[PDB]
């Protein structure tokens, strides 16, 4: 009856409210992230917001190293994001062991999607209020970005963004692509693609960034890594001499 708004069962309009609310939860952190694919790399930027001075700034991240190859950034509270990280790690390991090759991004995405689908269908499992963007330079497919949500949806993008100002970034991004006509930043070094990444997050959020305001992650052939405040700064500098 009127409990159809507590557990994942259908409402008379054919909706799962708990899933809906879970989506709203992803915004609680107030961080925006984007990801774009280079010619042979994949960058994801996510803002970093350290309010309290009493925290050790380096322990704050919503970007996670899943496997030597896959990188994942979460938009959502941390206890749910970490819970998803661990599992994504457990899964990527198991896949390597059982199949003899590294789990690809899309498959890892898909697998992560399916578990979510499950919380969507069983009363006892609450969905996780987080959206996961997996990125890597798959050995078979190239730079990749696959994102999943609490509804169990997942898909691949030419570039994406997520967070409170998703729409603004998306539109700026879409525009850049209509202009270029290609599906990736036509750039050789990931350093530059990281620049475009930040540059456009600035142009769209109408904000300037300091080194401790971003979190950057890159994924190249046979490796994914997070940038250091200093590598980030090298970028911040490079752009502040272009714009």
């Amino acid at each position: 009856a009127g409990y159809d708004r507590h557990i994942t069962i259908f409402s008379p309009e054919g909706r799962l409210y708990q899933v809906e609310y879970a989506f709203k939860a992803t915004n609680q952190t107030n961080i925006n992230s984007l990801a774009v694919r280079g010619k042979d790399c994949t960058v994801v930027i996510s803002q970093k917001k350290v309010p309290d001075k009493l925290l050790d700034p380096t322990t704050v991240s919503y970007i996670f190293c899943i496997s030597r190859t896959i990188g994942m950034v979460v938009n959502g509270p941390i206890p749910d994001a970490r819970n998803a990280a661990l599992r994504a790690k457990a899964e990527a390991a198991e896949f390597r062991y059982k199949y003899g090759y590294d789990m690809p991004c899309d498959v890892l995405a898909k697998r992560m999607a399916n578990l979510s689908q499950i919380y969507t269908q069983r009363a006892y499992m609450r969905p996780l209020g987080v959206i996961l963007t997996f990125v890597s330079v798959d050995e078979e497919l190239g730079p990749s970005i696959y994102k999943t949500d609490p509804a169990g949806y997942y898909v691949g993008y030419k570039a994406t963004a997520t967070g409170p100002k998703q729409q603004e970034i998306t539109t700026n991004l879409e525009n850049h692509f209509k202009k270029s006509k290609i599906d990736h930043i036509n750039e050789e070094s990931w350093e530059k693609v990281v620049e475009f990444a930040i540059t456009h997050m600035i142009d769209a959020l109408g904000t300037e960034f300091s080194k401790n305001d971003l979190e950057v992650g890159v994924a190249t052939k046979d490796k994914f890594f997070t940038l250091s405040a200093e590598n980030i700064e090298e970028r911040l500098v490079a752009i502040a001499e272009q714009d």
Binding site: K24, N27, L54, V60, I78, D80, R82, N83
Partner: protein, 244 residues
């Protein structure tokens, strides 16, 4: 409609988990305790309200060790905290058995997070009614951590929780601003005694028993030990002094 707060795993229309938040309240209604990270260790201290003179002095200990290099202190529903330490212990052992080396702090923390976060996933269990400040020394540094009923945790330069939370963080923020160099575990012990003392003012009614403990790479060898005797009085003194 309403009712989104009668069950622990239910998301509200605003995307919050009300039972987790009501849990936090049980925390706030509790004693204060803090953690000050330092140049090669961490110090923990907690206010211990003296309910009556019938209480035997220095006996109802509250800080807890995990393994041999980790201190744990929490404010709130004491038992929930103890429960959280039993798992910590078990998870520490499991790590050592399989890997030989004692559990690294970041890793210990996450093990804690994950168990707590798990208590916000089902409506057949209630979240934890405690926030925990814990840390210690490992292969590469000192680590201080605080965990909330939501399972959120992060690394701290200093941390505090409980009723005196605010004044405590006030003091702590002072320390971080004034001493960017770090603090000697010797100093931090004092400072902790202070912060607790000040923080007792937000509850200036009942008298208190101070309790500190530390883990320092040169003062305790990386092992968690409590502060007793000579070293304890020094801090109690340094405290009662700067209270005025």
């Amino acid at each position: 409609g309403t009712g989104y707060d009668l069950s622990n795993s239910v998301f509200s229309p605003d995307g919050r988990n009300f039972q987790v938040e009501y849990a936090v309240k049980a925390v706030e209604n509790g004693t204060t305790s803090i953690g000050i990270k330092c140049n090669d260790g961490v110090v923990f201290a907690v206010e211990k309200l003296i309910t009556s003179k019938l209480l035997v002095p220095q006996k109802n200990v509250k800080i807890q060790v995990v393994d041999r290099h980790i201190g744990c202190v929490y404010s709130g529903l004491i038992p929930d905290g103890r429960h959280l330490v039993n798992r910590g212990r078990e998870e520490a052992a499991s790590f050592k058995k399989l890997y030989k080396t004692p559990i690294p702090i970041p890793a210990f923390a996450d093990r804690l997070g994950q168990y707590v976060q798990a208590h916000t996933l089902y409506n057949s269990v209630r979240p934890f009614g405690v926030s925990t400040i814990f840390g210690g020394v490992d292969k590469n540094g000192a680590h201080l951590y605080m965990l909330e009923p939501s399972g959120s945790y992060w690394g701290y330069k200093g941390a505090a929780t409980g009723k005196g939370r605010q004044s405590a963080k006030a003091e702590l923020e002072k320390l971080v601003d004034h001493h960017p160099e770090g603090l000697s575990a010797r100093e931090a012990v004092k400072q902790a005694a202070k912060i607790i003392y000040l923080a007792h003012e937000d509850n200036k009614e009942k008298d208190f028993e101070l309790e500190i403990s530390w883990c320092s790479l040169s003062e305790t060898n990386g092992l968690h030990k409590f502060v007793k005797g000579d070293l304890l009085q020094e801090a109690i003194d340094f405290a009662q002094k700067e209270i005025n």
